Design a protein around this ligand. Structure first.
Ligand SMILES: C=C(C)[C@]12C[C@@H](C)[C@@]34O[C@](Cc5ccccc5)(O[C@@H]1[C@@H]3C=C(COC(=O)Cc1ccc(O)c(OC)c1)C[C@]1(O)C(=O)C(C)=C[C@@H]41)O2
Ligand SMILES: C=C(C)[C@]12C[C@@H](C)[C@@]34O[C@](Cc5ccccc5)(O[C@@H]1[C@@H]3C=C(COC(=O)Cc1ccc(O)c(OC)c1)C[C@]1(O)C(=O)C(C)=C[C@@H]41)O2
Lengths: 528, 80, 79, 67, 80
């Protein structure tokens, strides 16, 4: 920290002028721990530099003075210890509120205009930090929906700054008008496409569900879906259905002689059976390697592993059960059946993965995911505490009966939950009053109180997550699109849409700019 | 959704069962459906090996359908 | 009146201990009814585990709801 | 439950506080470290010439409003 | 349960001569939105009889804001 930082943060224009006049270093970095993100300690990150300090504090006059004074002009492209420029810092300080978005976007725009006028050849928005993120990619990853929404449809109506726009209006009738969006680093780029950044977000990103409603992304994803990906998705679903039918048939007609592997018989039915077994194992291997590929590409952090990437975990576990079944099969152990059936069960329930991406049925699978992860687990802990406590009490009371064991009595008390409780399942006790009082107390506490409490809590959670699921639909569709484009299996280039158009043809220099624009006609019946 | 769960677990259970009275998709599907209506036997057969696998499958099916899905249906119908 | 609408968990732990001590008395009094006491303590001993779920943002809500429901709503319904 | 979810949200903290106080009262080891925050001189100038040590506790807070 | 009065008292800062000693909150530095305070904590953490934490925790459950009074900045931070 230096006197220049203090003068700027104190909003002392005069002192800033004096310090710059006296040879203050406009590039001095305040790189103490207090000025870093450092989430476990208090602090205030601002990009560490006087220029980024002025920009983050909504002091435009100081920004202009620092950039274009006579004594010591500021380096607009300078980077802090994280690599962040002023624009990265402005993205960092956003909080998605109305006034915050207003001033942050205004300052972002003003800095871009000044950068063009001072350094027409300099492209600030292409500069990456140490994570490889441009300010657009940073805004996408961090969920700053306001800044992202500003940038993606930015239109600047003045000479010598039209090239800074990303949206261009060709014609306009009344409520209807046709625009061209730039789509650089949205559709594809070296590393951090905006779609890839949003889709592979860590699930803590605030507006990851809503960011895809921003006009160019929503239209681009719908176009990609209809043109390219819808058919491939349905084909994948169909193939998976065939795979599961073959697996079900092959498992159903397994031979019942002991001690696998089973000698192949010279008959038609056995050739079909072994063919189905081969295809089933093949699919298991395929899903195994697909899951490993996913984990290597993403590297989830053992907490994101279940609250996100849930379906990938389930597909991978299915494949693991399949492979364990194969190992046991050739190891001459009948326990392969124990593995196979689990895979078979999982293989069918993973069909629900394909219901996500449909705005009506996907919500059901999304709710199943959230409920299983949080609410069913908490309920089952409480329920199992009650069940085990009363089972231990009852089995202690029972003396030398048929039941007289934790397993039998736990199962018998569990039967009350499913509406099959016998309530006089044994008489091998003394103190019938104690036995019946325990059972009635257990019934009232679990069957009447806890289950209805579960109904109520699930009602509340459903009421609270329907709104989020409405967009999680679109998010999963985006993920499907990106995975389909990355796999693509045919060396197809047609997936890159929107065509190579000329925006202006007049940069600050004499070159022309072809920037792969995407045409979007929009209709607005408001703001007349 | 319910039929996906029912068919998946019915196929698993009937695969596990070997040469029983049930041992067929119809009988096991009907027997697992009985859990939905509060009539699930939960020990309707012993014609298997690996009792632990059988009971784990049944308990998982019960928890996923009877406890989770039906109450989820109640919540969704309340909303609608 | 505060004895149940507050200090609820302390009442339950105390009642568990009372069942234990009554069981001990019956045990040395040569009465098999000690079993009748012991199992109640045993059941309470397990359900009082829920006392430790309070103080966790997500789990504790469940036990808090159980307390309030048992005291008010379940009693009225059961009447 | 729709009416008592809001209350339970903070009953969490309340029960944590009760646990803290009971643990400090029992303590089973003659520990003094439970008394935190350190004995700092706050002003050093009472109405008379004496200095005040008041066991102050440092709290850094970040508020993105009221600019 | 007078949460308003409690919040006032625990965070009282008086900027004038000969009354600074009456404050219980003191601001050392404040840079951006971030600032570091010192709270008195006399009779909050420990005292002869009636610590604020002991009074709130052992409230009779009729106290209106017994749930919310622990959100007041010094108490929430102290308890955490
Ligand atoms: C937590 C995960 C890892 C999980 C994986 C397996 C073992 C699973 O048991 C669970 C534990 C469990 C068991 C029984 C009742 C509830 C929860 O739940 C799921 C998991 C629970 C499911 C629930 O069904 C689904 O999640 C279908 C599904 C929904 C949404 C999706 O995005 C999806 O993508 C694959 C799949 C079904 C099982 O996989 C299944 O069929 C069997 C045999 C056990 C279920 O573990
Ligand atoms: C009202 C109190 C004194 C109560 C004490 C005992 C006898 C209890 O019966 C009740 C009466 C009752 C019986 C059956 C159904 C509902 C209510 O409910 C509780 C009380 C009811 C419970 C309910 O479970 C809980 O309260 C666990 C619990 C929740 C929150 C907590 O803060 C807690 O701290 C200990 C414990 C379980 C029993 O203690 C138990 O395990 C047996 C054998 C009877 C239950 O009396």
């Amino acid at each position: 920290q230096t006197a220049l930082h203090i003068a700027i943060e104190r909003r002392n224009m005069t002192l800033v002028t004096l310090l710059v006049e006296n040879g203050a270093d406009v590039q001095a970095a305040a790189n103490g721990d207090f000025f870093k993100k450092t989430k476990g300690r208090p602090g205030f990150y601002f990009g560490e530099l006087p220029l980024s300090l002025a920009a983050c504090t909504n002091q435009l006059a100081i920004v202009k003075f620092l950039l274009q004074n006579s004594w010591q002009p500021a380096d607009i492209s300078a980077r802090d210890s994280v690599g962040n420029t002023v624009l990265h810092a402005l993205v960092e300080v956003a909080d998605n509120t109305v006034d915050n978005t207003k001033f942050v976007t205004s300052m972002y725009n003003e800095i871009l205009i000044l950068g063009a006028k001072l350094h027409p050849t300099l492209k600030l928005e292409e500069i990456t930090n140490r994570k490889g993120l441009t300010p657009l990619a940073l805004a996408a990853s961090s969920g700053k929906i306001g800044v992202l929404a500003y940038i993606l449809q930015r239109e600047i109506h003045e000479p010598e700054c039209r090239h800074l726009s990303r949206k261009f209006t060709e014609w306009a009738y009344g409520p209807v008008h046709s625009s061209l969006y730039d789509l650089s680093c949205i559709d594809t780029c070296e590393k951090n496409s905006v779609l890839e950044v949003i889709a592979y977000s860590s699930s803590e990103t605030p507006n990851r569900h809503d960011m895809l409603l921003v006009e160019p992304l929503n239209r681009l994803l719908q176009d990609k879906w209809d043109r390219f990906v819808k058919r491939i998705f349905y084909f994948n679903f169909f193939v998976y259905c065939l795979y599961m039918i073959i697996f079900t048939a092959a498992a159903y007609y397994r031979p019942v002689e002991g001690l696998p592997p089973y000698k192949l018989k010279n008959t038609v039915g056995d050739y079909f059976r072994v063919t189905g077994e081969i295809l089933s194992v093949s699919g298991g291997v395929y899903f195994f390697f697909r899951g490993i590929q996913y984990f290597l590409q993403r590297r989830p952090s053992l907490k994101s592993l279940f609250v996100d990437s849930y379906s990938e975990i389930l597909f991978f576990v299915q494949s693991l059960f399949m492979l364990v079944s194969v190992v046991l099969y050739f190891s001459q152990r009948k326990e392969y059946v124990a593995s196979m059936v689990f895979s078979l069960a999982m293989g069918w329930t993973n069909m629900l993965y394909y219901t996500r991406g449909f705005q009506q049925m996907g919500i059901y699978a999304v709710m199943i995911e959230k409920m299983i992860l949080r609410d069913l687990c908490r309920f089952m802990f409480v329920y199992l505490v009650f069940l085990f406590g009363f089972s231990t009490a009852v089995v202690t009371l029972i003396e030398d009966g048929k039941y007289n064991s934790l397993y039998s009595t736990c199962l018998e008390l569990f039967k009350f939950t499913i509406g099959m409780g016998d309530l006089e399942f044994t008489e091998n006790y003394d103190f019938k009053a104690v036995f019946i009082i325990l059972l009635l107390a257990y019934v009232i506490l679990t069957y009447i109180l806890l289950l209805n409490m579960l109904i109520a809590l699930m009602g509340e959670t459903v009421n609270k997550i329907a709104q989020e699921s409405k967009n999680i639909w679109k998010l999963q569709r985006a993920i499907t699109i990106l995975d389909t484009e990355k796999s693509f299996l045919k060396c197809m280039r047609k997936a890159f849409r929107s065509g190579k158009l000329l925006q202006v043809g007049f940069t600050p220099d004499g070159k022309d700019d072809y920037r792969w624009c995407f045409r979007v006609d929009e209709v607005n019946w408001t703001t007349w």
